Short mmCIF file of all heavy atoms in Angstrom, two decimals:
data_model
loop_
_atom_site.label_atom_id
_atom_site.label_comp_id
_atom_site.label_asym_id
_atom_site.label_seq_id
_atom_site.Cartn_x
_atom_site.Cartn_y
_atom_site.Cartn_z
N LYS A 1 31.20 154.81 96.88
CA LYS A 1 31.51 154.82 95.46
C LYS A 1 31.42 156.18 94.78
O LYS A 1 31.81 156.30 93.62
CB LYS A 1 30.64 153.79 94.74
CG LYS A 1 31.01 152.37 95.12
CD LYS A 1 30.23 151.35 94.31
CE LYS A 1 30.80 149.96 94.48
NZ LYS A 1 30.63 149.47 95.87
N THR A 2 30.96 157.21 95.48
CA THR A 2 30.89 158.55 94.90
C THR A 2 31.65 159.55 95.75
O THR A 2 31.85 159.34 96.95
CB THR A 2 29.44 159.04 94.75
OG1 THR A 2 28.93 159.39 96.04
CG2 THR A 2 28.56 158.00 94.10
N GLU A 3 32.03 160.66 95.13
CA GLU A 3 32.71 161.74 95.82
C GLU A 3 31.96 162.18 97.07
O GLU A 3 32.56 162.35 98.14
CB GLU A 3 32.90 162.92 94.88
CG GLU A 3 33.39 164.19 95.56
CD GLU A 3 33.97 165.18 94.57
OE1 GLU A 3 33.59 165.14 93.38
OE2 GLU A 3 34.81 166.00 94.98
N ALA A 4 30.65 162.39 96.96
CA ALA A 4 29.89 162.88 98.11
C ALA A 4 29.92 161.90 99.27
O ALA A 4 30.00 162.29 100.43
CB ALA A 4 28.45 163.18 97.71
N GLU A 5 29.85 160.61 98.95
CA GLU A 5 29.89 159.59 99.99
C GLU A 5 31.27 159.54 100.65
O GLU A 5 31.38 159.42 101.86
CB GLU A 5 29.56 158.23 99.39
CG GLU A 5 28.14 158.12 98.85
CD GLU A 5 27.99 156.96 97.90
OE1 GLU A 5 28.96 156.23 97.66
OE2 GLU A 5 26.88 156.77 97.36
N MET A 6 32.32 159.65 99.83
CA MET A 6 33.68 159.67 100.34
C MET A 6 33.92 160.85 101.27
O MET A 6 34.56 160.71 102.30
CB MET A 6 34.66 159.74 99.18
CG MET A 6 34.66 158.52 98.27
SD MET A 6 35.55 158.89 96.75
CE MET A 6 34.90 157.62 95.67
N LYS A 7 33.40 162.02 100.88
CA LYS A 7 33.59 163.26 101.62
C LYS A 7 32.96 163.21 103.00
O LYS A 7 33.37 163.94 103.90
CB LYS A 7 32.97 164.46 100.87
CG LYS A 7 33.81 164.99 99.73
CD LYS A 7 33.25 166.28 99.16
CE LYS A 7 33.44 167.47 100.09
NZ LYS A 7 33.22 168.76 99.38
N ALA A 8 31.95 162.36 103.15
CA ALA A 8 31.16 162.29 104.37
C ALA A 8 31.69 161.27 105.38
O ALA A 8 31.04 161.03 106.39
CB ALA A 8 29.71 161.99 104.01
N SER A 9 32.88 160.71 105.12
CA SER A 9 33.47 159.71 106.00
C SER A 9 34.74 160.22 106.66
O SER A 9 35.77 160.39 105.98
CB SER A 9 33.81 158.46 105.19
OG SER A 9 34.57 157.55 105.96
N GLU A 10 34.71 160.44 107.97
CA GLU A 10 35.95 160.80 108.67
C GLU A 10 36.95 159.65 108.63
O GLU A 10 38.14 159.89 108.62
CB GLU A 10 35.71 161.24 110.11
CG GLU A 10 34.79 162.44 110.25
CD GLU A 10 35.09 163.57 109.27
OE1 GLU A 10 36.27 163.92 109.08
OE2 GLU A 10 34.15 164.11 108.67
N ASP A 11 36.48 158.40 108.59
CA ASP A 11 37.41 157.28 108.46
C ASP A 11 38.25 157.42 107.18
O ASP A 11 39.46 157.19 107.20
CB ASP A 11 36.68 155.93 108.47
CG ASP A 11 36.11 155.57 109.83
OD1 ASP A 11 36.41 156.25 110.83
OD2 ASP A 11 35.34 154.59 109.90
N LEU A 12 37.63 157.80 106.07
CA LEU A 12 38.36 157.97 104.82
C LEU A 12 39.34 159.14 104.93
O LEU A 12 40.50 159.03 104.49
CB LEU A 12 37.38 158.16 103.66
CG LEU A 12 37.98 158.25 102.26
CD1 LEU A 12 37.03 157.66 101.24
CD2 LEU A 12 38.34 159.69 101.87
N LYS A 13 38.89 160.24 105.53
CA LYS A 13 39.77 161.38 105.72
C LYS A 13 40.97 161.04 106.61
O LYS A 13 42.09 161.50 106.36
CB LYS A 13 38.99 162.55 106.30
CG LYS A 13 39.78 163.86 106.39
CD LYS A 13 38.94 165.00 106.94
CE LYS A 13 37.86 165.46 105.98
NZ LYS A 13 36.68 166.05 106.69
N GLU A 14 40.76 160.22 107.64
CA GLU A 14 41.88 159.77 108.48
C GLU A 14 42.84 158.89 107.70
O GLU A 14 44.06 159.00 107.88
CB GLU A 14 41.38 159.09 109.75
CG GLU A 14 40.81 160.10 110.73
CD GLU A 14 40.55 159.54 112.12
OE1 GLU A 14 40.35 158.32 112.26
OE2 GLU A 14 40.52 160.34 113.07
N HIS A 15 42.34 158.05 106.81
CA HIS A 15 43.27 157.28 106.00
C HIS A 15 44.08 158.19 105.08
O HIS A 15 45.28 157.98 104.89
CB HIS A 15 42.59 156.19 105.19
CG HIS A 15 43.59 155.27 104.60
ND1 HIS A 15 44.38 154.48 105.40
CD2 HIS A 15 44.03 155.10 103.34
CE1 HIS A 15 45.23 153.81 104.64
NE2 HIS A 15 45.04 154.17 103.39
N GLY A 16 43.45 159.20 104.51
CA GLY A 16 44.19 160.17 103.71
C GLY A 16 45.28 160.85 104.50
O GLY A 16 46.36 161.14 103.99
N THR A 17 44.99 161.11 105.77
CA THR A 17 45.96 161.69 106.70
C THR A 17 47.14 160.73 106.92
O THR A 17 48.30 161.15 106.89
CB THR A 17 45.28 162.05 108.03
OG1 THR A 17 44.21 162.97 107.79
CG2 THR A 17 46.26 162.69 108.98
N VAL A 18 46.85 159.45 107.14
CA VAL A 18 47.89 158.42 107.27
C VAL A 18 48.77 158.37 106.02
O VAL A 18 50.01 158.36 106.11
CB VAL A 18 47.25 157.04 107.55
CG1 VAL A 18 48.24 155.90 107.37
CG2 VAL A 18 46.66 157.02 108.96
N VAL A 19 48.14 158.36 104.85
CA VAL A 19 48.87 158.25 103.59
C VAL A 19 49.81 159.43 103.38
O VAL A 19 51.00 159.26 103.11
CB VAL A 19 47.89 158.08 102.41
CG1 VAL A 19 48.59 158.25 101.07
CG2 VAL A 19 47.21 156.72 102.49
N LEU A 20 49.28 160.65 103.49
CA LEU A 20 50.12 161.81 103.24
C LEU A 20 51.14 162.05 104.33
O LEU A 20 52.22 162.56 104.05
CB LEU A 20 49.30 163.07 102.95
CG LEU A 20 48.48 163.07 101.66
CD1 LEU A 20 47.95 164.47 101.39
CD2 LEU A 20 49.26 162.57 100.45
N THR A 21 50.84 161.69 105.57
CA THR A 21 51.84 161.81 106.63
C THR A 21 53.01 160.87 106.35
O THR A 21 54.17 161.25 106.51
CB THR A 21 51.24 161.52 108.01
OG1 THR A 21 50.22 162.49 108.29
CG2 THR A 21 52.31 161.57 109.09
N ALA A 22 52.72 159.65 105.90
CA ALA A 22 53.78 158.71 105.53
C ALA A 22 54.62 159.27 104.39
O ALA A 22 55.85 159.26 104.45
CB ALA A 22 53.18 157.36 105.13
N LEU A 23 53.95 159.78 103.36
CA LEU A 23 54.67 160.34 102.23
C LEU A 23 55.53 161.53 102.65
O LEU A 23 56.67 161.65 102.21
CB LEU A 23 53.68 160.75 101.14
CG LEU A 23 54.32 161.32 99.87
CD1 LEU A 23 55.30 160.36 99.22
CD2 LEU A 23 53.23 161.70 98.88
N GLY A 24 55.00 162.41 103.49
CA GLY A 24 55.78 163.55 103.97
C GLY A 24 57.06 163.13 104.67
O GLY A 24 58.12 163.72 104.45
N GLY A 25 56.98 162.11 105.52
CA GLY A 25 58.16 161.59 106.20
C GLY A 25 59.19 161.06 105.22
O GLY A 25 60.39 161.28 105.38
N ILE A 26 58.71 160.38 104.20
CA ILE A 26 59.56 159.85 103.14
C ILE A 26 60.23 160.99 102.36
O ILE A 26 61.43 160.95 102.13
CB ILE A 26 58.73 158.94 102.21
CG1 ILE A 26 58.40 157.64 102.95
CG2 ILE A 26 59.48 158.66 100.91
CD1 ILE A 26 57.24 156.89 102.35
N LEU A 27 59.46 161.99 101.97
CA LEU A 27 60.02 163.11 101.21
C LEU A 27 61.12 163.83 101.97
O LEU A 27 62.12 164.24 101.39
CB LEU A 27 58.93 164.10 100.79
CG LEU A 27 57.88 163.56 99.81
CD1 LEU A 27 56.77 164.58 99.64
CD2 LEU A 27 58.50 163.19 98.48
N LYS A 28 60.95 163.96 103.29
CA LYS A 28 61.94 164.65 104.11
C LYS A 28 63.26 163.88 104.24
O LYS A 28 64.25 164.45 104.67
CB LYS A 28 61.35 164.98 105.48
CG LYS A 28 60.24 166.02 105.40
CD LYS A 28 59.52 166.19 106.73
CE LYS A 28 58.15 166.83 106.56
NZ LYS A 28 58.18 168.30 106.73
N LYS A 29 63.27 162.61 103.83
CA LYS A 29 64.52 161.86 103.73
C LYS A 29 65.32 162.18 102.46
O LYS A 29 66.46 161.74 102.33
CB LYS A 29 64.27 160.35 103.78
CG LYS A 29 63.54 159.85 105.01
CD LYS A 29 64.20 160.27 106.30
CE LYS A 29 65.58 159.68 106.48
NZ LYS A 29 66.09 159.96 107.85
N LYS A 30 64.73 162.92 101.53
CA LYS A 30 65.42 163.34 100.31
C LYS A 30 66.10 162.16 99.61
O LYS A 30 67.28 162.22 99.24
CB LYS A 30 66.43 164.46 100.61
CG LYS A 30 65.80 165.70 101.22
CD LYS A 30 66.73 166.90 101.26
CE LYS A 30 68.07 166.62 101.91
NZ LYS A 30 68.88 167.87 101.92
N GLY A 31 65.33 161.09 99.44
CA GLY A 31 65.80 159.92 98.72
C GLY A 31 66.50 158.87 99.57
O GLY A 31 66.66 157.73 99.13
N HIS A 32 66.93 159.23 100.78
CA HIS A 32 67.57 158.27 101.69
C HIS A 32 66.48 157.58 102.49
O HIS A 32 66.40 157.72 103.70
CB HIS A 32 68.55 158.98 102.61
CG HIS A 32 69.64 159.69 101.87
ND1 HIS A 32 70.62 159.03 101.18
CD2 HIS A 32 69.88 161.01 101.70
CE1 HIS A 32 71.43 159.90 100.62
NE2 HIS A 32 71.01 161.12 100.92
N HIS A 33 65.64 156.81 101.78
CA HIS A 33 64.37 156.35 102.33
C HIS A 33 64.18 154.84 102.25
O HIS A 33 63.06 154.36 102.33
CB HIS A 33 63.19 157.07 101.64
CG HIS A 33 63.18 156.93 100.15
ND1 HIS A 33 62.72 157.93 99.32
CD2 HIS A 33 63.57 155.92 99.34
CE1 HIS A 33 62.82 157.54 98.07
NE2 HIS A 33 63.34 156.33 98.05
N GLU A 34 65.26 154.08 102.09
CA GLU A 34 65.14 152.62 102.00
C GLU A 34 64.33 152.03 103.16
O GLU A 34 63.42 151.22 102.95
CB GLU A 34 66.53 151.97 101.95
CG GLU A 34 66.57 150.47 102.21
CD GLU A 34 65.86 149.64 101.16
OE1 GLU A 34 65.78 150.09 99.99
OE2 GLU A 34 65.40 148.52 101.48
N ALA A 35 64.66 152.44 104.38
CA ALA A 35 64.01 151.89 105.58
C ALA A 35 62.52 152.22 105.63
O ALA A 35 61.72 151.41 106.12
CB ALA A 35 64.70 152.40 106.83
N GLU A 36 62.14 153.40 105.16
CA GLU A 36 60.74 153.83 105.13
C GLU A 36 59.96 153.13 104.04
O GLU A 36 58.79 152.81 104.22
CB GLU A 36 60.64 155.33 104.91
CG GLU A 36 61.05 156.18 106.10
CD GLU A 36 62.55 156.39 106.25
OE1 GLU A 36 63.34 155.92 105.40
OE2 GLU A 36 62.94 157.03 107.25
N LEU A 37 60.59 152.94 102.88
CA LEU A 37 59.88 152.37 101.73
C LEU A 37 59.73 150.88 101.83
O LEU A 37 58.74 150.33 101.35
CB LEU A 37 60.58 152.70 100.41
CG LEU A 37 60.41 154.11 99.87
CD1 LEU A 37 60.64 154.13 98.37
CD2 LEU A 37 59.04 154.68 100.19
N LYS A 38 60.73 150.22 102.42
CA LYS A 38 60.73 148.78 102.58
C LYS A 38 59.38 148.23 103.03
O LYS A 38 58.78 147.46 102.27
CB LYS A 38 61.82 148.35 103.56
CG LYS A 38 62.02 146.85 103.65
CD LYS A 38 62.43 146.28 102.30
CE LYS A 38 63.51 145.22 102.44
NZ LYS A 38 63.03 144.06 103.24
N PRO A 39 58.88 148.63 104.23
CA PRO A 39 57.64 148.02 104.67
C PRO A 39 56.45 148.39 103.81
O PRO A 39 55.54 147.59 103.68
CB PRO A 39 57.45 148.60 106.08
CG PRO A 39 58.08 149.94 105.99
CD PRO A 39 59.34 149.63 105.21
N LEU A 40 56.44 149.60 103.24
CA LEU A 40 55.32 150.02 102.41
C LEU A 40 55.26 149.20 101.15
O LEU A 40 54.20 148.75 100.76
CB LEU A 40 55.38 151.50 102.07
CG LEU A 40 55.07 152.40 103.26
CD1 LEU A 40 55.29 153.84 102.84
CD2 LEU A 40 53.64 152.20 103.75
N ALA A 41 56.40 149.01 100.49
CA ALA A 41 56.41 148.18 99.30
C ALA A 41 55.90 146.79 99.63
O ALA A 41 55.06 146.24 98.92
CB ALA A 41 57.81 148.12 98.71
N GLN A 42 56.39 146.22 100.73
CA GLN A 42 55.99 144.86 101.13
C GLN A 42 54.51 144.77 101.45
O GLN A 42 53.83 143.85 100.99
CB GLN A 42 56.75 144.36 102.35
CG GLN A 42 58.14 144.90 102.55
CD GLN A 42 58.91 144.06 103.50
OE1 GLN A 42 59.03 144.37 104.70
NE2 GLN A 42 59.39 142.93 103.00
N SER A 43 54.00 145.69 102.27
CA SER A 43 52.60 145.62 102.66
C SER A 43 51.72 145.85 101.45
O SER A 43 50.69 145.21 101.31
CB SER A 43 52.26 146.62 103.77
OG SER A 43 52.24 147.94 103.27
N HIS A 44 52.13 146.75 100.56
CA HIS A 44 51.30 147.09 99.42
C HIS A 44 51.28 145.98 98.37
O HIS A 44 50.24 145.73 97.78
CB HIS A 44 51.68 148.46 98.87
CG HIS A 44 51.16 149.57 99.72
ND1 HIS A 44 51.47 149.69 101.06
CD2 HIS A 44 50.27 150.55 99.46
CE1 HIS A 44 50.81 150.72 101.57
NE2 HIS A 44 50.08 151.26 100.62
N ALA A 45 52.39 145.28 98.19
CA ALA A 45 52.42 144.14 97.28
C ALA A 45 51.71 142.94 97.87
O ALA A 45 50.82 142.36 97.25
CB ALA A 45 53.85 143.76 96.94
N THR A 46 52.10 142.56 99.08
CA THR A 46 51.76 141.24 99.61
C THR A 46 50.44 141.21 100.34
O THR A 46 49.69 140.23 100.25
CB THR A 46 52.84 140.73 100.56
OG1 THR A 46 52.84 141.51 101.77
CG2 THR A 46 54.21 140.76 99.88
N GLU A 47 50.16 142.28 101.09
CA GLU A 47 48.95 142.37 101.89
C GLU A 47 47.81 143.08 101.15
O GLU A 47 46.72 142.52 101.03
CB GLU A 47 49.24 143.08 103.21
CG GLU A 47 48.11 142.96 104.21
CD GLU A 47 48.31 143.79 105.45
OE1 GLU A 47 49.39 144.40 105.64
OE2 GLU A 47 47.36 143.83 106.24
#
């Protein structure tokens, strides 16, 4: 629940890596990203 606790978790840092790696792949599509966004929208809404 605090910054210091968050900073001390490699699991949290790995999730940040997953998130930004996904976003980077999406950005490199320059808007042609339907296939990439599809599952993320679904997982984020439904799951």
Side-chain angles (χ1 to χ4, degrees):
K1 292 185 168 66
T2 73
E3 170 162 25
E5 296 162 0
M6 295 167 200
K7 281 188 72 165
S9 171
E10 301 315 316
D11 289 350
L12 184 148
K13 187 178 290 152
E14 287 191 335
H15 192 64
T17 302
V18 166
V19 168
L20 294 191
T21 298
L23 182 58
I26 288 160
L27 295 173
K28 293 171 200 266
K29 303 306 296 189
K30 301 192 307 182
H32 301 292
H33 56 214
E34 165 65 28
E36 287 81 3
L37 284 203
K38 188 61 139 62
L40 288 175
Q42 331 197 261
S43 72
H44 284 57
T46 69
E47 192 187 353

